[PDB]
Design a binder for these strands. Structure first.
Ligand SMILES: [Mg+2]
Ligand SMILES: [Mg+2]
Ligand SMILES: [Zn+2]
Lengths: 34, 221, 227, 57, 56, 94, 1112, 170
DNA sequence: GCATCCGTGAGTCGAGG
DNA sequence: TATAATGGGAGCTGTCACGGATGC
RNA sequence: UCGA
């Protein structure tokens, strides 16, 4: 009953992340200040 | 503009044989043993058949029905066997980097054994369209590069070049020669035939294969 | 049992004097094509417009001949003349003859026609003929007010012996296409949505065209009055 | 499939046939732990063989 | 004249050149007009529509 | 077909990556109540109601439309997961 | 309306009673009208004679038996869910040989189910049918050895479970082997035991190829029959001590014992005819004067050697021949199970005789009837050949009763199914119908008996033929078997006859099934009718000769599925069989004798016959059938009406004035319509619903039980906790819904309260209880409600309560309530319609009248069928029918076309012209000319070459009308269809498959016990099975989340599904799934197999999916 | 066996766009039921979930606002239609459902070839993808309009046939 | 090396009692 | 709790072809 | 047994 290793379950495409730019720079400044 | 003619010719419905049974003679029939009666039905469905004729045809009809009913089970079983044997195969990467390939012949030995003749268009398309070239091919002043996914026009072109006697066989990346473990790669596979574009990594081509072979199982006669 | 029907809103969407869309919803079951088909028939047959009925060209005997010094044949010219959109400003005017005389290395447009009182050419940039060095074009074209579409061999009019009859396209409307879609108001399921699309030549607008069409129809309903 | 007028790409049949050709049988163990007549995967015997070749065996 | 094969070819070409969205729209169009015209075409089947040739 | 689907297939290297991107983004939108949307008020997908046009309740529609704009970024290892979560929670409370 | 009939073939004899294969069989088996001393040795009498006497008092013998009267009438049996049956008594006498004491008594053996008049049964209040089985007739057969080409196998087959199959083969080493119970031993041995000597066998068999040396073994002839007998016993029974009497007992029981080994009467007949011998008994040998005497074996071996050598007059056998295949009818199957139960009773007897006081034993003390009772009950309930009766329409019942299965007990396993079985044999002619048979897995197995076909006393099927002497056809009819038929040249029924003499110089005939052209001098016999070749259902298809067999099959089969319509009509075009089917099905009600009708009522008809006697026939009204179709008779006569013998009184269900009505006659047009008829789909007019065409009544039975519980009694009550008056509105004082009320899904039929399971209220329940200050009720609402998508008007209510007269229920049950809910169903989108020609389709569109294609006179068509269905399906009959229908529309008349001797094209053209005069001349007289649109269409037809140019509009319109085509106007436009369209009357039925019954959906519902996956079925509010192949689909698509979702959240993941539902109702996205419960079940079931299944991480350290609950 | 899955008799869909199918009101009511409860709670139709469900329990307690609410629910979503036997991946396809009266499922004429479905009384099963992921997969990957070509041959699997071809030819 | 027995497989979903 | 009693008895049959162990 |  696990997720099959194909399609949306392929290790190639499944770890992909989505972030809107507005949040992206907001994290980038946190990485920039530290 | 006759309705039967039109429907048959357009591919809307009907084939020459059914139409023939309608306006023609019904034709020869088989005995239960597969043996054929010496006396054919001379009647169409328009004219109507004698009871004897009808009875004679019933043998064939029944045999056909039984054949189909028995065929569906075997087709299904086969399909499941294929699904089971191919299920782990999925495209796992872009390139396995193999230098190995297969050569699709454009010519086959004639039954007369006189010479080699051009294979049928559909067959060539079946062994060609969508595939990636494993080597440079120069024909009719055209450069088909190593790594090129053959479009339909590429295939037709190769057919033309073959008719011109420039090329007898086409080197191509194939799953037979793919070195990818547990699956195949993108290049060895080629087009995702549904999208007519290179296959997306993660497409399960084993199941697609099994289904593609199995599906017209019950059609085979 | 009891049925109450809300008034149906009428909508319009137009692009220039050429094209428009017309939406009428909701309508009772079946009334989508009840309104649709007649208006289409009326719009194609009955809408008043102007057409090129007859054409005379100097030194030209019949329709299939060839004109020295000009590139397009008599056929092609007549075709271009079919696409001429001419508008009558004075409601009195029933017909006009337009004259055109030009020569030498020139491309004749619809602008080249000598202006007539209360006669407007909507498409002056329409091409008529290309002439070369030593080319000469003298032509008189007849323009009549009428409706629908009359082939050249039906009206069969000639002012002179060499005047060629032209298939007369009177209808300012080039196309009418309607489509009825199912629509619902509350729990009323089967109601109709009428969407009408009208192409004209610009002499009459689609909206005007549709307004004339509904007027004609209404006027016919009054014919059931007096036995 | 051609006889019945079914257009089918060689690709799929190749996948299956490949899966039939998945296996091999040992004709001699050499320096391995395997046995004569022992059946195994072509991939595994190729990996083992490259390991033994890299090991100088 | 437009038949099964030619229409199939049209769908393939349109898929290639114009993509699947436009090919979808094309398919719906073809469906609509095909149906509409087939309705009024006058196509029917009578017993006299099966024509026994003399040559028989 | 989904509007502009050909372009969406053009964006990724594999269709399934597109799918994952869309779905994840849609979950982001659902969790934050769309407050994180990159769509301008005019670009908002609308649903026709008995009253009038309202916002489209379907986060996947939104996701694909946003993706079409180019205002979204997709890829592997762009940021630690908990950092992304906490930052989005900071900017857009749930 | 005038009914015109075609065809020149005069049927000499009518069809035999169509239910006789059932009725006469069971009657032959019971012999209940025959005085006990006059009965024969066949049937249950045979069973008694076989079982008794019982020996080792030490003797109990059978004298006679008797059947009493049924304790309850048929209708009362249907009411109380009892069985229609008669008490079986048997005269027995106990005899102690020494004492000489004789004690005689009549013992009660239980009850035997009685067959009703129509040939059906009632078992537990449900009508059922016993389907005749087909099998290989017992006898001696000779078959080619598939391995050795020039060698053959002899096979001696007895009746099923009547003893073993025996094989005689000639071994490669030359010796002749016998095979019994899978043991190969030399036949010579048994031959010696039979008392044969080398001399006798040498003089008997010697003439064949010097092959007899394979039969010669000196070690066998060197020993007397006793030694060879013990030898054979040692060969057949290893480890069993070879005692003499034990060997005699075993061998006798294996071969000569009639109480064990039995060939059929047909078995012995065919044995005798094949081997050219005579059989004293039905066994292979005898025990006579202490020794075994031969009957079968030597002639068998003789014929075998003769066939092997090539001696003329010897031939192999076709085992699919209908002379080698017989039919076990109701009586034979019932007799078999009766025999088994009786044998069990005998074992009980012998077991009782040894024990107990040896002095006082009555037959009553010896006989336990229970095994016999159980045998019969079993045969009538759980048998495969005992089927729930199909009563949908009368034809369903009839055809059901006329079925022949190759399956069932003693019959072939599906696996054993092969083509040779399923094939249509040449000998099926006139016996088993070549058409009627199911599509799919069951094809060629389930078949149907031909119309004229009869089953004789030996179980074989026979068909009638007319005697022809010197070119003169007599009226003498001879029913032959296939073996008999093969002896003659038999002419076709359509051959020209002037008077009784054959008028053709060349006549078409059959010799051994082979078609042949012969002279009248050569013609021995002639067919009775084309009707004899097909089944009853197939005989109902007009223009059958114009239909391809495959579709005709579908028409035939689909007639059985026809729902009786309130408005139902006999077909415009009939085959002439529609009256008989109504009669033999006991559907309608007729006049017993001549007389005058006194009373006519909805509920009854009273008739005074010529005797002066008053006979009152009650009418069955709105009775629910097995399939839920309403069966009711309506009176067709009036007060004072003079009637003769056989005249109609009432019309049964699906009957119009005594003719079979399976459907409606509708005006149909064959044209494509806007893709709504695309791929067999159908477009219908709202005017069909308006006038109630295709509208039928359906009754559903609901049931509930109030029983005794350990937690206290369930009781039907109007007092139901937490329900408003709005809920209890239609419920009476006792809690049962009132007659005449309308019920919708969710409504209560029977109110019921049950005592709650022991409650340990959760703290939430207690706090809420305190908040609202209301004591938790003792009982709870168990009331039977209306299942989703069901409903109607309450018609009857039955209440059976314990403690009330005539009423006793199953133990623990206080009372049982049944609510009958009927409904009047109109035709709707998704319902299935079909015609007699195999054209079947779902209604996809219902158009308002103004959208329907209409005739110039303003008449809208009913059904619009797509022409694309015709050519591929090759059934042209439906076309022809329509054409004739067209004429019949304007002449106001119906027709009878004998199939195969019907209405030819020219005559239909004549009728069509006569119709055209009515259709047109009326118009021209009414002061109307030809329409402009008609002119346009005519121009369009001229280009088509459908009309000759230059003729007048009227002449051309007639030309088209003769071809069955008319001008049609589109109702949406008013513009004509560019071509002329085929339009006319067609007979179309609504089938039993209706979208109302089939539409089902579920969000969440009941789960299976062990697997915790959703239940299957609509009744269970089940889920859709997502199979392996659907998983394949989702995989191939590559949607992992949808798939995993199916495998977990939507099926057996309990935490996951609860969390899913909660997430969705909360407006949250669904949580990630966890381990499906059925995998845990897999793990645990593997552990019980002593296999350790360990889920591990990547570090190979175990992961507990049971969360510590299973670990100590 | 799965939850959130219906079945019914198919009927021709000619007015449908390629991406659509007719889904009966009641079928969708049951299949979408929890979403319908939540949506009913969002609007003024019901005070809470339990009351809403008790409201949907009896047919005479059901009112138009719940149908409109159901329309609001299904917006943008698709369902999976499947016909047995499923021989290849096109035996299941994704369709944006369009609510219809009556008990029948409306299927688009162009997909009938891939399903090997016809109108002779065939039936199809419906499945509602739940998660946003399932929905995304169904809509991008499994949508009817998104697979026009056979994965096997490569030729168009969605093409004119029967009446369509007939008309265009005519 | 070559007969022979034994075990195991032989299409999907749905309906009804 | 006491005459004496001592080896059972249903199988049951129109497939089928594969593979992999078992005997001249 | 029936339906696809
Ligand atoms: Mg409408
Ligand atoms: Mg079908
Ligand atoms: Zn590779």
């Amino acid at each position: 009953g696990r997720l099959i290793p194909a399609g949306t379950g392929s290790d190639f495409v499944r770890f992909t992340q989505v972030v809107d730019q507005k949040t992206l720079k907001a994290i980038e400044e946190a990485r920039k200040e530290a | 503009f006759n309705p039967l003619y039109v429907m048959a010719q357009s591919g809307a419905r009907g084939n020459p044989q059914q139409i023939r049974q309608l306006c023609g003679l019904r034709g020869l029939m088989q005995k239960p043993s597969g043996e054929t009666f010496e006396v054919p039905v001379r009647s169409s469905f328009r004219e109507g058949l004698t009871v004897l004729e009808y009875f004679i045809s019933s043998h064939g009809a029944r045999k056909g029905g039984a054949d189909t009913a028995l065929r569906t089970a075997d087709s299904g079983y086969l399909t499941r066997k294929l699904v089971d044997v191919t299920h782990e195969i999925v495209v796992r990467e872009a390139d396995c980097g193999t230098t190995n390939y297969i050569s699709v012949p454009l010519f086959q030995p004639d039954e007369v054994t006189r010479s080699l003749r051009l294979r049928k268009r559909a067959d060539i398309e079946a062994g060609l369209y969508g595939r990636v070239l494993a080597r440079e091919v120069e024909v009719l002043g055209v450069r088909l590069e190593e790594g090129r996914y053959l479009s339909m026009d590429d295939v037709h072109l190769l057919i033309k070049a073959a008719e011109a006697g420039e090329i007898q066989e086409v080197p191509v990346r194939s799953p037979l020669t793919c070195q990818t473990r547990y699956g195949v790669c993108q290049k060895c596979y080629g087009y995702d035939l549904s999208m007519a574009r290179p296959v997306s990594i993660g497409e399960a081509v084993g199941i697609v294969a099994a289904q593609s072979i199995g599906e017209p199982g019950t059609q085979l006669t | 049992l009891d049925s109450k029907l809300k008034a149906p809103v009428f909508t319009v969407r137009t692009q220039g004097r050429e094209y428009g869309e017309f939406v009428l919803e909701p309508l009772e079951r079946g009334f989508g094509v009840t309104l649709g088909n007649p208006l289409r028939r009326i719009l194609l047959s009955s809408i008043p417009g102007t057409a090129v009925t007859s054409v005379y060209i100097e030194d030209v005997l019949h329709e299939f001949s060839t004109i020295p010094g000009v590139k397009e044949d008599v056929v092609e010219i007549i075709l271009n003349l079919k696409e001429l959109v001419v508008r009558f400003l004075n409601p009195s005017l029933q017909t006009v003859t337009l004259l055109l005389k030009a020569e030498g290395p020139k491309e004749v447009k619809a602008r080249d026609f000598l202006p007539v009182a209360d006669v407007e050419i909507m498409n002056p940039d329409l091409h008529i003929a290309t002439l070369e060095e030593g080319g000469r074009l003298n032509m008189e074209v007849r323009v009549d007010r009428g409706v629908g579409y009359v082939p050249a061999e039906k009206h069969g009019i000639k002012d002179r012996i060499n005047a060629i009859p032209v298939d007369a396209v009177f209808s300012p409307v080039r196309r009418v296409a309607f489509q009825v879609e199912d629509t619902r108001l509350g729990q009323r399921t089967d109601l109709d949505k009428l969407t009408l699309r009208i192409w004209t030549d610009g002499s009459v607008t689609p909206l005007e065209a549709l307004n004339q069409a509904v007027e004609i129809l209404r006027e016919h309903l009054t014919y059931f009055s007096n036995p | 499939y051609r006889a019945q007028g079914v257009k089918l790409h060689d690709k799929h049949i190749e996948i299956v046939v490949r899966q039939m050709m998945k296996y091999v049988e040992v004709t001699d163990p050499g320096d391995s732990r395997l046995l004569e007549g022992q059946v195994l995967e072509k991939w595994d015997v190729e990996a083992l063989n490259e390991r033994l070749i890299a090991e100088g065996k | 004249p437009q038949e099964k094969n030619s229409l199939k070819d049209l769908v393939y070409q349109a898929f290639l050149r114009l993509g699947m969205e436009k090919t979808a729209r094309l398919l719906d169009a073809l469906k609509y007009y095909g149906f509409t015209f087939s309705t009024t075409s006058g196509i029917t089947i009578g017993i006299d529509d099966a024509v026994i040739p003399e040559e028989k | 077909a989904e509007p502009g689907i050909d372009k969406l297939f053009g964006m990724v290297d594999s269709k399934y990556r597109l799918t994952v991107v869309v779905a994840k983004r849609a979950q982001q939108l659902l969790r934050h109540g769309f407050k994180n949307t990159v769509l301008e008020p005019e670009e908002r997908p609308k649903m026709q109601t008995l009253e009038g046009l309202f916002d489209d309740p379907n986060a996947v529609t939104w996701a694909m439309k946003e993706l079409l704009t180019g205002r979204l970024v997709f890829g592997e290892n762009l940021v630690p997961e908990d950092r992304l979560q906490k930052e989005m929670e900071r900017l857009y409370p749930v | 309306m005038e009914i015109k009939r075609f065809g020149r073939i005069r049927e000499v004899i009518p069809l035999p009673p169509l239910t006789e294969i059932q009725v006469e069989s069971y009657r032959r088996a019971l012999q209940a009208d025959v005085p006990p001393e006059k009965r024969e040795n066949v049937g249950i009498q045979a069973a008694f004679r076989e079982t008794f006497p019982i020996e080792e008092g030490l003797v109990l013998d059978f004298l006679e038996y008797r059947l009493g009267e049924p304790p309850f009438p048929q209708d009362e049996c249907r009411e109380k869910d009892l069985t229609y049956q008669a008490p079986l008594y048997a005269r027995l006498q106990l005899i102690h040989k020494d004492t000489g004491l004789i004690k005689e008594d009549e013992v009660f053996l239980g009850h035997i189910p009685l067959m009703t008049e129509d040939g059906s049964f009632i078992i537990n209040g449900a009508d059922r049918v016993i389907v005749s089985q087909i099998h290989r007739s017992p006898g001696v057969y000779f078959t080619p050895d598939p391995a050795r080409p020039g060698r053959y196998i002899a096979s001696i087959i007895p009746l099923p479970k009547r003893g073993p199959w025996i094989d005689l083969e000639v071994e490669p080493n030359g010796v002749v082997s016998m095979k019994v119970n899978k043991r190969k031993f030399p036949l010579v041995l048994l031959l010696r035991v039979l008392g044969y000597d080398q001399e006798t066998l040498a003089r008997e068999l010697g003439a064949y190829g010097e092959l007899v040396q394979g039969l010669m073994d000196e070690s066998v002839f060197a020993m007397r029959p006793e030694e060879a007998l013990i030898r054979l016993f040692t060969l057949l029974r290893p480890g069993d001590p070879p005692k003499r009497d034990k060997a005699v007992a075993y061998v006798y029981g294996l071969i000569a014992d009639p109480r064990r080994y039995d060939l059929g009467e047909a078995g012995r007949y065919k044995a005798e005819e094949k081997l050219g011998i005579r059989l004293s008994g039905r066994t292979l040998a005898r025990f006579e004067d202490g020794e075994f005497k031969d009957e079968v074996f030597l002639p068998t071996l003789r014929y075998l050697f003769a066939l092997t050598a090539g001696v003329p007059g010897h031939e192999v056998d076709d085992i699919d021949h209908l002379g080698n295949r017989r039919i076990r009818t109701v009586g034979e199957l019932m007799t078999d199970q009766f025999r088994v139960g009786l044998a069990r009773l005998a074992r009980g007897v012998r077991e009782r005789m040894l024990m107990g006081s040896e002095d006082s034993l009555t037959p009553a003390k010896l006989v336990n009837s229970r095994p016999l009772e159980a045998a019969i009950r079993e045969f009538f309930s759980r048998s495969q050949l005992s089927q729930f009766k199909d009563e949908t329409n009368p034809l369903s019942s009839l055809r059901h009763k006329r079925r022949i299965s190759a399956l069932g007990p003693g019959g072939l396993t599906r696996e054993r199914a092969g083509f040779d079985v399923r094939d249509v044999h040449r000998t099926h002619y006139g016996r088993i119908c070549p058409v009627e048979t199911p599509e799919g897995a069951n094809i060629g197995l389930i078949t149907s008996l031909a119309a004229y076909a009869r089953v004789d006393e030996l179980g074989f099927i026979r068909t009638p033929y007319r005697r022809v002497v010197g070119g003169v056809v007599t009226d003498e009819v001879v029913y032959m078997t296939a073996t008999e038929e093969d002896r003659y040249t038999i002419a076709q029924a359509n051959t020209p006859l002037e008077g009784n003499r054959i008028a053709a110089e060349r006549v078409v005939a059959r010799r051994k099934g082979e078609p042949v052209i012969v002279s009248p001098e050569e013609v021995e016999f002639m067919d009775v009718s084309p009707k004899q070749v097909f089944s009853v259902n197939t005989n109902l298809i007009p223009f059958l000769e114009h239909d391809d067999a495959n579709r005709a099959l579908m028409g035939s089969n689909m007639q059985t599925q026809a729902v009786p319509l309130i408005r139902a009509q006999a077909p415009v075009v009939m085959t002439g069989l529609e009256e008989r089917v109504v009669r033999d099905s006991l559907a309608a009600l007729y006049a017993e004798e001549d007389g005058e009708v006194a009373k006519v009522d909805g509920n009854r008809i009273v008739v005074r016959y010529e005797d002066g006697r008053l006979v009152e026939y009650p009418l069955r009204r709105f009775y629910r059938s097995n399939q839920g179709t309403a069966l009711d008779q309506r009176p067709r006569v009036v007060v004072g009406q003079r009637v003769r013998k056989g005249d109609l009184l009432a019309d049964g269900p699906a009957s119009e004035n005594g003719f079979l009505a399976l459907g409606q006659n509708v005006l149909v047009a064959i044209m494509p319509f806007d893709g709504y008829n695309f791929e067999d789909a159908i477009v219908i007019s709202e005017e069909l619903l308006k006038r109630d065409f295709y509208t039928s009544i359906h009754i559903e039975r609901y049931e509930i039980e109030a029983r005794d519980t350990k937690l206290g009694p369930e009781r039907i009550t109007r007092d139901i906790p937490h329900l408003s008056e709005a809920a209890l509105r239609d419920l009476d004082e006792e809690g049962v819904v009132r007659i005449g009320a309308e019920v919708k899904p969710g409504d209560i039929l029977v109110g019921r309260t049950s005592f709650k399971g022991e409650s340990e209220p959760t703290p939430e329940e207690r706090l809420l209880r305190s908040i609202f200050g209301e004591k938790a009720r003792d009982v709870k609402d168990t009331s039977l409600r209306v299942p989703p998508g069901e409903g109607g008007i309450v018609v009857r209510t039955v209440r059976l309560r314990r403690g009330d007269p005539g009423v006793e229920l199953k133990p623990g049950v206080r009372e049982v309530v049944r609510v009958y809910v009927a409904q009047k169903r109109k035709l709707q989108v998704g319902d299935k319609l079909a015609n007699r020609h195999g054209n079947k389709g779902v209604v996809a569109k219902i158009l308002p009248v103004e959208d329907m294609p209409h005739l110039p006179d303003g008449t809208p068509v009913d059904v619009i069928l797509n022409p694309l269905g015709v050519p591929s399906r090759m059934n042209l009959g439906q076309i022809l029918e329509t054409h004739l229908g067209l004429a019949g529309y304007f002449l106001g008349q119906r027709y009878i076309s004998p199939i195969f001797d019907g209405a030819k094209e020219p005559e239909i053209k004549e009728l069509l012209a006569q119709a055209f005069e009515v259709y047109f001349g009326k118009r021209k007289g009414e002061g109307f000319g030809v329409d402009k649109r008609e002119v346009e269409v005519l121009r369009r037809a001229e280009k088509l070459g459908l009309v000759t140019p230059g003729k007048t509009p009227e002449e051309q319109l007639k030309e088209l009308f003769l071809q069955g085509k008319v001008v049609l106007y589109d109702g949406r436009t008013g513009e004509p269809i560019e071509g002329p369209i085929v339009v006319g009357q067609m007979f179309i039925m609504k089938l039993y498959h209706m979208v109302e019954d089939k539409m089902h959906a579920r969000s969440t519902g009941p789960y299976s016990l062990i697997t915790q996956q959703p239940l299957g079925g609509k009744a269970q509010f089940g889920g859709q099975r997502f199979g392996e192949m659907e998983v394949w689909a989702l995989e191939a698509y590559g949607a992992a989340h949808t798939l995993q979702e199916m495998l977990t959240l939507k099926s057996d993941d309990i935490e996951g599904r609860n969390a899913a539902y909660e997430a969705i109702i909360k407006g949250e996205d669904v949580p990630e799934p966890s381990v499906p419960e059925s995998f845990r079940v897999l793990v645990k079931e593997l552990q019980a197999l002593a296999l350790d299944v360990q889920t591990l991480d990547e570090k190979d350290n175990p992961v507990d999916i049971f969360e510590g609950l299973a670990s100590k | 066996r799965v939850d959130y899955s219906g079945r019914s008799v198919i009927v021709v869909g000619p007015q449908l766009k390629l991406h659509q199918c007719g889904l009966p009101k009641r079928m969708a009511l049951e299949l979408f039921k929890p979403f319908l409860l939540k949506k009913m709670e969002e609007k003024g139709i019901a005070p809470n979930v339990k009351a809403a469900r008790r409201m949907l329990e009896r047919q005479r307690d059901i009112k138009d606002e719940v149908w409109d609410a159901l329309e609001e629910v299904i917006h943008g979503k698709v369902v999976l239609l499947n016909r047995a036997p499923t021989l290849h991946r096109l035996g299941i396809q994704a369709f944006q459902p369009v609510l219809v009266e009556g008990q029948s499922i409306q299927l688009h004429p162009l997909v009938c070839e891939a399903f090997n479905a016809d109108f002779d009384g065939d039936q199809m099963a419906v499945h509602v993808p739940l998660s946003s992921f399932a929905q995304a997969e169904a809509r991008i990957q499994m949508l009817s309009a998104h697979n026009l070509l056979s994965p096997a041959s490569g030729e168009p699997l969605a093409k004119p046939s029967r009446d369509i071809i007939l008309g265009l030819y005519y």
